[PDB]
Amino acid sequence: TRTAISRREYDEWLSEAASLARALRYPVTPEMVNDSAGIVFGDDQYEAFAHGLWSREPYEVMVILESLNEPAVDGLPAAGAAHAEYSGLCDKLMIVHPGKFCPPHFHQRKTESYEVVLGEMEVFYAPEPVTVGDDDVLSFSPMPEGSPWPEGVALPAGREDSYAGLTSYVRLRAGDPKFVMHRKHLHAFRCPADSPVPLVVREVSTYSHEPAPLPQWRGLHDNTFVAEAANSGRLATAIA
């Protein structure tokens, strides 16, 4: 079983991803292409490189090219310091290959939106938010119900039940209006296994806490995965 990805496989992965990104006019800088851009969600997912990114096999692995992760703390009244972590601006291009997924998870603080650039994106999510603590939460425009999953979706082996709670589905195509994923909502997405191209999606959200513009923000991790295996990994991609 694969426990890491070779330097060649990794470099070819991100190079082709950065090139596709540039072809689509996303502003890729050299610093955006690094050994952290290629994400493998769990040690058992490294097996995705056994057959490769074009095997069309179900695995939770992806590339994220982040052009912006602005705290937007400057000018903010000190009184709002306690909730600043729910704000900020983040812009990133995500590239997922055929059959691959961004594993089930939710953000206590981050609210995101999706803009499909190339290919089509199948989103799986829970329309009802998850109750974190309990404390009064604000409401305005709740998540739409969506539709039931279409048949045929193959989930990664050993991670399928972590998708159980994400009963809602939506298929986004390039040109569609922005789709918002409010914080506290479990969600995951994939590139259709029969896709001729990798899914390229622009995510515009609030700050992405993933280890200090603020003392409280130190060591903050705003990504909680349903599967415990997904947590450990993606903390540093193992490249041999």
Place this chain on the structure above:
Amino acid sequence: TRTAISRREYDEWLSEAASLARALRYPVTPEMVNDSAGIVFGDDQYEAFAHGLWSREPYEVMVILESLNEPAVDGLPAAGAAHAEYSGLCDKLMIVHPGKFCPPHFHQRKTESYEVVLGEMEVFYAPEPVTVGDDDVLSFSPMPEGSPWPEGVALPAGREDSYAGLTSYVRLRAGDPKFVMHRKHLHAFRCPADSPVPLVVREVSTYSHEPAAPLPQWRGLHDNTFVAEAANSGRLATAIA
């Protein structure tokens, strides 16, 4: 001197703007192409159409196609209600023709970022922030010093001194790193007058308050403060004949 834009001029202006957007892969739907997407900053700026958007003359006129303006209030602890207006998510595509400007102004709440898609953007701004609302504010990444103004910038007739406070300059090209314009900073920008194409830039920012409200204290909130008196009002509607 004219005080309005003909229906034909407005439609061609916005239709080409929306076509260019779609060509650049921006998500445009019909509701986005409306009567307030084409902004003329002041009644004296309607003169821009006397000769047209390709005359290369300096005027404060532009088109804004907004694909997103999410309050991002859902899920926020009730405790944060007071400053939620400083957050939110906004995504828009701005199109500025050769020599045209987005006039000097600042936002009390909105922090924005720039991504040039087509053409080049000349940004004029003030590195020092003003103080509006609260006088006890946070600080992390102060605005960069930028560069002195380049030579040969033509400013709008009658509006020249409104640019005096924008002493820093930076020219942004497609592919450059995102440029952040922190809230409470005076800024403006233009498409070089000698550009062969309109400037097309994506603005990713916090919620855009521009008159059911996400929150009661959000009703009628004005977040755009223009340096020039004549521009703060004008933006509030486009005279179409």
Place this chain on the structure above:
Amino acid sequence: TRTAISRREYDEWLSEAASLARALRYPVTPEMVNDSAGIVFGDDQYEAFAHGLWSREPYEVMVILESLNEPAVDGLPAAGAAHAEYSGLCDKLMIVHPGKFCPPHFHQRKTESYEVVLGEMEVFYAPEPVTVGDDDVLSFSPMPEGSPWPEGVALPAGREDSYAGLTSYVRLRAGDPKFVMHRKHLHAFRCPADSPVPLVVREVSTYSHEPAPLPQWRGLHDNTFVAEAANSGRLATAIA
């Protein structure tokens, strides 16, 4: 009735066309943007600028940005001089606004192909070639039958019967395979009147004879329009 287009209308027309072309990555050089790029097929078509390119009214007017018109006569055996005019390479981007058309016509010598870049293109043509002289003509892959015209197509006023012979129809969208229009076939096309964007199509064909790499090629005009009004015009755009 309009008898010309103003300099402002013309300059705005081609400027916005060149910009859209550049946005789509077509290689536009300054010399490609000239007072001949904007075509009006007949003096009576200048009325298209009465209400403008976004009136969605039926008129035969368009912009052609030609990046290549190579005779390809160099290296060609002298023995082939007599038929060289049927060869050559031409690459041009055509921009047609909503409801507008490229009038009915055929080329004795030029064979063309279409690649839709933006919008959708509705092609109207005669599946049977026109017999020019008579002389033995070669055959290989004749034009497909196509489909009958969909309902609702509005033709330019006073030119509608010139479309009578173009009984076949096909709708090309961006991403579709190349569509070939063999020489000697009458054809015309338009941008759907309800289109949100101008139709942008890349035409790759054999040499476009439109007034000398060869003595015979001097003064050669390979565009014959069904409507006599279309002929006279487009020989020089009247710009006031």
Place this chain on the structure above:
Amino acid sequence: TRTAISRREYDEWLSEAASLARALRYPVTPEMVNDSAGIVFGDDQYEAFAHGLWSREPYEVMVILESLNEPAVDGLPAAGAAHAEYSGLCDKLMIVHPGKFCPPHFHQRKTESYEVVLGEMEVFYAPEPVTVGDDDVLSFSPMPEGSPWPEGVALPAGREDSYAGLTSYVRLRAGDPKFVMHRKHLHAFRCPADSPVPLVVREVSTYSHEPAAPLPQWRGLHDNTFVAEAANSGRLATAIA
């Protein structure tokens, strides 16, 4: 030293190539992504995958996605049958990775043009034509003189002198005027070795004869003559393990 490319390497190579093409708006259909679209010019060039298409090493390997190859014989006077093979219409997208080459060769019949879509193209060619077939040929626009070779070009090991006859050089960028390579002229090109992206260029040319024929005399017609012996054969198939 290897003599083939694994199935995985071939599929990733072509899938990324086709994805980049689609991103660049080129019309790609499934039949175009096949076992002969990935070309390795000679058995010794399979070594390119020992380290991969991103090693930046000099090898003669490339991908060609052909969207059109029209004989354009329909409608042609029977009198022109003899030289119809010099006409036709071909449209293909070529993808060359950093440092890789499309080896030295010439075409008796094919005249081609270049349009760089992504990256930059370094073209090496001979301004003087060879004489093949007929010795009485036409002339109108002789090949431009171009420039001397730039410094630092790394050529494929064992293939260096095959480039001796290509004394002219021209570097083409996206947006440049179309570049025509007349038939019967030796030429080759590469993607700069320091390029961050693969070279993507559209070739618009006359019919591509590369083994029902449009005409009987077209059957088995070979129109690619490679300078290096080892490359003329290799192109005729891709060893996939």
